[PDB]
A paper describes a structure:
14-Demethylation of 31-norlanosterol is a prerequisite for subsequent 4α-demethylation and 24-methylation steps, leading to biosynthesis of essential ergosterol and ergosterol-like sterols. Depletion of ergosterol, concomitant with the accumulation of intermediates and end-products incompatible with normal permeability and fluidity of the Naegleria cell membrane, leads to the altered morphology and death of N. fowleri cells.
The top hit (2a) had a miconazole-like scaffold (1) and was singled out following cocrystallization with the NfCYP51 target. The well-defined electron density in the binding pocket adjacent to heme corresponds to the S-configuration at the chiral carbon center of 2a. Superimposition with fluconazole indicates that both molecules coordinate to the heme iron with the azole moiety, while other aromatic moieties of each compound are engaged in different sets of drug–target interactions. The cocrystal structure of 2a revealed three main groups of drug–target interactions. The aromatic nitrogen atom of the imidazole moiety provided a coordination bond to the heme iron. The C2–C3 edge of the 4-fluorophenyl moiety faces heme propionate (6.3 Å) and the OH-groups of Tyr107 (5.3 Å) and Tyr120. For CNS compatibility, we propose staying within the binding envelope of 2a and avoiding extending molecules into the hydrophobic tunnel.
Residue numbers in the entry: 35 to 485
C-alpha cells in the first residue's frame, strides 16, 4: 500500500550520502530496483520519488491544499523575504505576487528587451576584444546580471551595477544559498544576510527614486513599453484592496531577479556549448540566423520569434541539463499513486533530469540532437514527457522571457564571433540549488568583422 522503500544506510541520515553524491543517479538507480514510485528517508524527511512520465498527472494537477509548495520552499525566506512568494500568507497572495512579475513580461516589453540585449553585448565585446578565450558560464552569468536587471527593474538600475557593486552583492547572496537549507532552514549564513540587507537598501532607494520620477513624469505610466516590474509594484494593490509594503516589493524584485538570472545563464551556457561543438548543428543554426537577419545588422523581437531551430537547441539542452533538477511538493493529505497511498507529510519529488534521460521517451538520450524534438517529436509521446518548465498550475511564467533571453544572447554572440569550445562537454555539478556545468567551461572566440 505504501511504496517500496530504499533501505537506509543509517537511521535519520537514511539515504542522504548517495542522494547527495548524485541525486539524478540516485533516482535512476533506485527506480531500477523499486520501480516507478519509491520512498527514501533523507536527513529525517520522507521523500517519495515519482519516476515515470505516465504517473505524473496527479502531481501536476493537484491543488495547493493537497500538494503544497509553500511547505517545501519556505526555506527561501531569508533570500526572498518575509511574506513573499513561498512565505506569503496564503497561496492566493503568492499567486498575486507572481502576477506582478509576469505583468512586466509583455510583448511591448519584449521588443525593448531585445535592444537591451544588443546594448549589453555591445559593452561586453569591448572587454573581450577582437579575439581570446573566456569562460562560457561566467560570460553568460555576467551578461544576464545586466540584462535581467535592466529588463525587470528599468534602466535606472544600471548605474548601481556599474558604480555601487550591485552585481557582487548578487553573487554574495547566491553564494550563500545552499541546497542543504532545504533540510535545515536555520543554517546561519552571515555573509548572505549582509549582502541581502545591502541589496535591500539599494532597491529601497530605487523604489524612492522611482516614486519621484512618477510624480515628475506621470506619462511614463501610460507607456506600456516603458513600464517595468518596479512600476507595476508601485502602482498596483492586492485584489482585496490591501496595499503592498516596501518590504514585499523588495522581496518580489529579489525573487524576480533570482528567477530571471540563474536558469537562463545556465541554459545559455549548455546551449551555446552544444551548438558550437557540433558542426552540423552549428551549420543549421547559422543558416537560420542568416536567413532571418537578411540585410539587417541588429536583432528585433520578430526576428527572435522566427528562430525555431535555435529554440529547439535550447529545448534539447533543457532535456539533457535542466537547471532545476527536482520539483517538490508536500502532501497535506494522503495521495493515491498507481496502486499506492502516499502518506500525509511525505515530500513528492519529480525530476526533469530523470525525465530527460528516460529511454521510454528518448532514443540515445545521451546525445544532443535537436531533431529528436523537431522531426521525431519524441517529447510528445507522453503528456509529461518533457517538463523542464514544469506543468499545470505552477508552470513557469518566465518561459517566453527565458526563451527570448537565451535565443537573443546566443544569436547576438554568433553574429559577432566565431567560437570553438575547448575540450569535452562537461557533466552537471550537483553543488548548487540551480544546477550548472562543472567548471572549467572555456571557449575561443574571434570577431567576424575585424575592421
Ligand atoms: C530556462 C529558464 C527557466 C527554467 C528552466 C525555469 C523552470 C521552471 C520550472 C521547472 C518551474 C516549475 C516549478 C514548480 O512546479 O515547482 C518554474 C516555475 C516558475 N518560474 Fe521558471 N524557469 C525559467 C525561467 C524563469 C524566469 C526567467 C522567470 C521570471 C522572470 C521564472 C519565473 C517562474 C515562476 C514565477 C514560476 C512559478 C512558481 C510557482 O507558481 O510557485 N522562471 N520555472
Ligand atoms: O525564483 C523562483 O523560483 C526558483 C525556481 N525557478 C527559477 C526559475 N523558474 C523557477 C526557486 C524555487 C524554489 C526554491 F526553493 C528556490 C528557487 C520564483 C518562484 C516563484 C515566484 C518568483 C517571483 F515571481 F519572482 F516572485 C520567483
Ligand atoms: Ca546512502
Ligand atoms: Ca521523474
Amino acid at each position: 500500500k505504501l511504496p517500496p522503500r530504499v533501505p537506509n544506510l543509517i537511521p535519520y541520515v537514511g539515504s542522504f550520502v548517495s542522494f547527495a553524491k548524485n541525486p539524478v543517479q540516485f533516482i535512476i538507480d533506485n527506480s531500477k530496483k523499486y520501480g516507478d514510485v519509491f520512498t527514501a528517508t533523507i536527513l529525517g524527511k520522507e521523500m517519495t520519488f515519482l519516476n515515470h512520465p505516465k504517473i505524473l498527472d496527479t502531481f501536476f494537477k493537484a491543488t495547493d491544499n493537497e500538494l503544497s509548495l509553500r511547505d517545501v520552499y519556505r526555506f527561501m525566506r531569508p533570500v526572498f523575504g518575509t511574506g513573499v512568494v513561498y512565505d506569503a500568507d496564503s497561496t492566493e497572495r503568492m499567486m498575486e505576487q507572481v502576477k506582478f512579475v509576469s505583468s512586466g513580461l509583455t510583448t511591448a516589453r519584449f521588443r525593448v528587451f531585445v535592444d537591451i540585449f544588443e546594448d549589453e553585448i555591445a559593452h561586453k565585446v569591448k572587454e573581450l576584444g577582437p579575439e581570446g578565450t573566456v569562460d562560457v558560464a561566467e560570460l553568460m552569468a555576467d551578461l544576464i546580471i545586466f540584462t535581467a536587471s535592466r529588463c525587470l527593474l528599468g534602466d535606472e538600475v544600471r548605474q548601481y551595477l556599474s558604480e555601487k557593486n550591485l552585481g557582487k552583492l548578487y553573487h554574495d547572496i547566491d553564494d550563500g544559498i545552499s541546497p542543504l537549507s532545504f533540510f535545515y532552514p536555520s543554517l546561519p549564513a552571515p555573509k548572505r544576510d549582509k549582502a541581502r540587507k545591502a541589496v535591500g537598501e539599494i532597491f529601497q532607494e530605487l523604489l524612492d527614486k522611482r516614486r519621484e520620477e512618477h510624480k515628475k513624469h506621470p506619462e511614463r505610466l501610460l507607456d506600456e513599453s516603458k513600464m517595468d516590474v518596479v512600476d507595476h509594484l508601485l502602482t498596483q494593490k492586492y485584489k482585496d484592496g490591501q496595499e503592498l509594503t516596501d518590504v514585499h516589493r523588495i522581496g518580489i524584485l529579489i525573487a524576480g531577479l533570482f528567477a530571471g538570472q540563474h536558469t537562463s545563464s545556465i541554459t545559455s551556457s549548455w546551449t551555446l556549448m552544444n551548438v558550437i561543438s557540433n558542426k552540423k548543428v552549428l551549420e543549421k543554426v547559422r543558416k537560420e540566423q542568416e536567413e532571418i537577419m537578411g540585410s539587417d545588422k541588429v536583432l528585433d523581437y520578430d526576428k527572435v520569434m522566427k528562430m525555431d531551430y535555435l529554440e529547439a537547441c535550447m529545448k534539447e539542452a533543457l532535456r539533457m541539463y535542466p537547471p532545476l533538477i527536482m520539483i517538490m511538493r508536500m502532501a497535506r493529505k494522503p495521495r493515491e499513486c498507481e496502486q499506492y497511498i502516499i502518506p500525509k507529510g511525505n515530500i513528492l519529488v519529480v525530476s526533469p533530469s530523470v525525465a530527460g534521460r528516460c529511454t521510454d521517451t528518448y532514443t540515445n538520450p545521451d546525445v544532443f540532437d535537436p531533431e529528436r524534438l523537431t522531426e521525431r517529436k519524441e517529447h510528445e509521446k507522453f503528456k509529461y514527457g518533457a517538463v523542464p518548465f514544469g506543468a499545470g498550475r505552477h508552470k513557469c511564467i518566465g518561459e517566453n522571457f527565458a526563451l527570448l533571453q537565451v535565443k537573443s544572447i546566443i544569436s547576438i554572440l554568433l553574429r559577432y564571433f566565431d567560437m570553438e569550445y575547448i575540450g569535452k562537454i562537461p557533466d552537471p555539478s550537483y553543488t548548487s540549488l540551480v544546477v550548472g556545468p562543472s567548471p572549467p567551461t572555456r571557449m575561443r572566440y574571434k570577431l567576424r568583422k575585424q575592421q
